[PDB]
Amino acid sequence: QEAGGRPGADCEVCKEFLNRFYKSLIDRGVNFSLDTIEKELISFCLDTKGKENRLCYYLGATKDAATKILSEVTRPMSVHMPAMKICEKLKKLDSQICELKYEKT
Numbered sequence: 001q002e003a004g005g006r007p008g009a010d011c012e013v014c015k016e017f018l019n020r021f022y023k024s025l026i027d028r029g030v031n032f033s034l035d036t037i038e039k040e041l042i043s044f045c046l047d048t049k050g051k052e053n054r055l056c057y058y059l060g061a062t063k064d065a066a067t068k069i070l071s072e073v074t075r076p077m078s079v080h081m082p083a084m085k086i087c088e089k090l091k092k093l094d095s096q097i098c099e100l101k102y103e104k105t
Contacts, residue, residue, distance in 0.1 A: 002019070006019070008087070009090075010085075010087035010088045011097065013101065014087040014097050014100075017056070019083070021040075021041070025037060031078060033078070034071070034078055037077045037078060038074050042061055042063060055100050058090075058094055058097045059097070061073075072093075
């Protein structure tokens with residue numbers, strides 16, 4: 001998972017999720033299928049810690065929460081894309097996505 005330097009996207013939890021999810025699907029060979037990216041969003045979103053399990057409510061997934069924005073993740077996740085800046089695009093959809101910091105402590 002991950003990448004050296006954590007170049008996920010923008011804020012933090014949003015970036016780590018996108019980046020790790022993104023290169024995971026590409027590496028696992030579990031991509032190029034929008035419906036699959038949707039199902040794996042479900043899988044990955046719930047199979048993580050509260051920060052990410054909660055973060056996904058802002059991004060979609062879980063077959064609930066926000067169903068429209070879900071497609072705006074899966075589609076660019078299907079091809080090597082801006083996904084870092086996509087969290088910046090996400091900022092235009094909601095600003096709260098930029099937070100949820102793992103450990104401010």
